[PDB]
């Protein structure tokens, strides 16, 4: 068409994840492939390209069509003469057991528009980013390459980032408290290692910056709503800003290096919270924090600040100088101290008209207790029914980004990342040639169904040195 979308590119697009569509589209998506096989048995319809580059599967994952994405991956065409199109093949099936070979051709980080590269890095405007990665292969696909050659590299980064901050902290707590900030290295074992602490801190702080620049106005070019969705990579970028802010002041002879450094620190330890993208039961707990500070704080604080700035202002007007808690600041602070658990109720006797001065504070405490309560009630009645599922689902995504960004840290080698499947043959083309295809294995069992399903690839069951193919309509 004018956009270049074919029949199949449309069937993906027209769906909207409802039942009738999903029941429908998968069927029509089945037939046309069977026909395109029977009519012209060379056209690889699932490998054609629209003007934006996306293959149908790529479009499906991109726009977020879960039902279609299920079918395209875990299809199974029993019909002979058109078996090459299938993906979920079944190798050895010793009775109740059956081992399957979910194909991988366009869903591993080797092709341009791999789904897993699309699903994770795409906008939050794509509905069901999460539920796509709960399809059968992609889910187990990640946890394995977590359990090999990522969990090691990840924990290694966790080690180094700790060693960064222990040094950074160490530079700080032993910072020179003297005159202006160039500080003119004096000779002592401490100060040789002090300046070492400075340099490693800066030289590492700039690393987050550059890797942050690589994220923002480079690969994954994000927009404003996408900055806040991608919450973490701001914070590690924001850390480097204060840090690279601090170093300027340190050489600009201005004392304010300490301020910038401190904010950078506090995020930095708070940033170590980020590397619980491993460690499932804690990763769930970090993601919650990410989902009040974007969804359930900018509401609440605007409310609580009003009462505060209101009832504080109320008190300040009343009280007349004659200690000297007359400033708006000092007063606003007191009414914050009721909240945490230190409330004077008597913090000045410089008031005229007691009864006014008490009714407000008591009316502030009350409404505050009303207001801290609904922050609890609303979160329950709004989402407690389902966060443990969603938050878990968010974690599996938020691990998935880490996996992919880690694979890219390996330039193109992939040598221990072609994601087992080792070009297992699974049949023959519909002209006679072999059909070697990458295939992640999955073992299963069904006790009701007994897996007499046609499509066995290997007569002798199993997986060892020595494979022997079946009369799969040779």
Ligand X SMILES: COc1cc(CNC(=O)CCCC/C=C\C(C)C)ccc1O
85, 89, 67: which is closest to 442 by C-alpha?
89
* Percent composition of the chain: helix, strand, coil (DSSP 3-state, to 5): 55, 5, 40
207 binding partner (options ligand X, ligand POV, Na ion, none; Cβ < 5 to 8 Å by kind): ligand POV
Identify what 341 binds: ligand X, Na ion, ligand POV, none; CB under 5 to 8 Å per kind. Answer: Na ion
Minimum CB–partner distance for residue 215 and ligand POV (Å): 7
φ, ψ of residue 99 in degrees (nearest 5): -105, 130
**How many helices (H) and strands (E) in the chain?**
17, 5
Q: For residue 469, what are its two tokens?
A: 């193919």
**Binding characters for ligand POV, 71-100, by CB under 6 A (x = yes):** ------------------------------
Binding span for ligand X by CB under 6 A among 47-55, 266-274, 426-434, 462-470: 266-274
Q: Euclidean distance between the first and final Cα of the chain, in Å?
A: 38
Does 318 participate in binding ligand X (rule CB under 6 A)?
Answer: no
Compute the radius of gyration of the chain from its Cα atoms.
30
Residue for token digits 């609580």? 304
- The Cα–Cα gap between 99 and 445 comes to 8
Query: Which bin fits 95, alpha (ψ -120 to 50), beta or left (φ > 0)?
Result: left
Chain position whose Cβ is nearest to ligand X: 274
Tokens representing 233 are 């990579």
255 touches 178 (CB < 8 A): no
Does 240 bind ligand X (CB under 6 A)? Our answer is no
CB nearer to ligand X: pick between 277 and 419? 277
Read off φ and ψ for residue 428, nearest 5 degrees: -140, 155
Residue with tokens 């004659």: 322
30 close to 45: Cβ distance less than 8 angstroms: no
Which of residues 108 and 290 has its CB atom nearest to ligand X in the complex?
Answer: 290
CB of 232 to ligand X, least distance (A): 4
Q: Does 367 bind ligand X (CB under 6 A)?
A: yes
> Judged by CB under 6 A, which of 166, 210, 372, 414 binds ligand POV?
166
Q: Among 208, 237, 274, 357, which residue sits at the site for ligand X (rule: CB under 6 A)?
A: 274
Query: CB–CB of 276/286 below 8 Å?
Result: yes
> Nearest approach, Cβ of 341 to Na ion (angstroms)?
4
269 is a contact residue toward ligand POV (CB under 6 A) = no
> Taking CB under 6 A as the rule, does residue 159 contact ligand POV?
yes
Q: Which residues lie near Na ion (CB under 5 A)? A: 341
Contacts of 389 (CB under 8 A, 6+ apart): none
CB under 5 to 8 A by kind: which of ligand X, ligand POV, a second copy, none does 382 bind? a second copy
Rounded Cα–Cα distance for residues 290 and 293 (Å): 6
Residue from 266, 373, 388, 445 binding ligand X (CB under 6 A):
266
Q: How far apart are CA 197 and CA 166, in angstroms?
A: 9
Q: Residue 290's binding partner, choosing from a second copy, Na ion, ligand X, none, with beta-carbon cut-off 5 to 8 A by kind?
A: ligand X
187 φ, ψ to 5°?
Answer: -85, 115
Quick note: the x/- pattern for ligand X over 333-362, rule CB under 6 A, is --------------------------xx--
| Residue 304 token pair | 């609580």
**235 interacts with, out of a second copy, ligand POV, ligand X, none, CB within 5 to 8 A per kind:** ligand X
Question: Is 305 near ligand X (CB under 6 A)?
Answer: no
Helical residues (DSSP H) of 174-188, grouped into ranges: none
55 or 271: whose CB is closer to ligand X? 271
- Among the residue ranges 34-42, 117-125, 162-170, 317-325, the one whose residues contact ligand POV (CB under 6 A): 162-170
Does 284 interact with ligand X (rule: CB under 6 A)? no
In the complex, least distance from residue 63 CB atom to Na ion, rounded to whole angstroms: 49
Q: Check if the beta carbon of residue 261 is closer than 8 Å to that of residue 223.
A: no
Q: Pick from 293, 372, 414, 454 the residue near ligand POV by CB under 6 A.
A: 293
Q: Is 445 strand, coil or helix?
A: strand
Query: Which residues, other chains included, contact 358 with Cβ-Cβ below 8 Å and sequence gap of 6+?
Result: 345
In the complex, the residues that contact ligand X under the rule CB under 6 A are: 232, 235, 263, 266-267, 270-271, 273-274, 286, 289-290, 359-360, 363, 367
In the complex, the residues that contact ligand POV under the rule CB under 6 A are: 155, 157-164, 166-167, 169-170, 173, 200, 204, 207-208, 211, 232-233, 236, 238, 241-242, 245, 256, 259-260, 279-281, 293, 298, 301-302, 305, 308, 327-329, 332, 336, 353-355, 358-359, 362-363, 366-367
């Amino acid at each position: 068409d004018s956009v270049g979308n074919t029949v199949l590119h449309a069937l993906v697009e027209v769906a909207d994840n409802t039942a009738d569509n999903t029941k429908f589209v998968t069927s029509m998506y089945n037939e046309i492939l069977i026909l395109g096989a029977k009519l012209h048995p060379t056209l690889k319809l699932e490998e054609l390209i629209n003007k934006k580059g996306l293959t149908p599967l790529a479009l499906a994952a991109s726009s977020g069509k879960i039902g279609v994405l299920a079918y395209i991956l875990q299809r199974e065409i029993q019909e002979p003469e058109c078996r090459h199109l299938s993906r979920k093949f079944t190798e050895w099936a010793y009775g109740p057991v059956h081992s399957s070979l979910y194909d991988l051709s366009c869903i591993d980080t080797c092709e341009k528009n791999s789904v897993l590269e699309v699903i994770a890095y795409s906008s939050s405007e794509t509905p069901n980013r999460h539920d796509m990665l709960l399809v059968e292969p992609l889910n187990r696909l990640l946890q394995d390459k977590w359990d090999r050659f990522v969990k090691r590299i990840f924990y290694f980064n966790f080690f180094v980032y700790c060693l960064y901050m222990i040094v950074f902290t160490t530079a700080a707590y032993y910072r020179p408290v003297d005159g202006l900030p160039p500080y003119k290295l004096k000779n002592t074992v401490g100060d040789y290692f002090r300046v070492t602490g400075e340099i490693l801190s800066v030289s590492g702080g700039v690393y987050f910056f550059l890797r942050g620049i690589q994220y923002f106005l480079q690969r994954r070019p994000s927009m404003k709503t996408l900055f806040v969705d991608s919450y973490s990579e701001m914070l590690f970028f924001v850390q480097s800003l204060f840090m690279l802010g601090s170093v300027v002041l340190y050489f600009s002879h201005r004392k304010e290096y300490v301020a910038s450094m401190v904010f950078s620190l506090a995020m930095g330890w708070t940033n170590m919270l980020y590397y619980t993208r491993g460690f499932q039961q804690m990763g769930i707990y970090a993601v919650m924090i990410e989902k009040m500070i974007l969804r359930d704080l900018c509401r609440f604080m605007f409310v609580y600040l009003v009462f505060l700035f209101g009832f504080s202002t109320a008190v300040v007007t009343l009280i007349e100088d004659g200690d000297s808690y007359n400033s708006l600041y000092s007063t606003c602070l007191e009414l914050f101290k009721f909240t945490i658990g230190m409330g004077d109720l008597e913090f000045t006797e410089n008031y005229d008209f007691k009864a006014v001065f008490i009714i407000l504070l008591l009316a502030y405490v009350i409404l505050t207790y009303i207001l801290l309560l609904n922050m609890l009630i609303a979160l329950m009645g709004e989402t407690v029914n389902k966060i443990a599922q969603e938050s878990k689902n968010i974690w599996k995504l938020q691990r998935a980004i880490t996996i992919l960004d880690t694979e890219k840290s390996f330039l193109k080698c992939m040598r221990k990342a072609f994601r087992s499947g080792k070009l297992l043959q699974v049949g023959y083309t519909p002209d006679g040639k072999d059909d070697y295809r990458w295939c992640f294995r999955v073992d299963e069992v069904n006790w009701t169904t007994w897996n007499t399903n046609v499509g066995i690839i290997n007569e002798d069951p199993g997986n060892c040195e020595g494979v022997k193919r079946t009369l799969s309509f040779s």
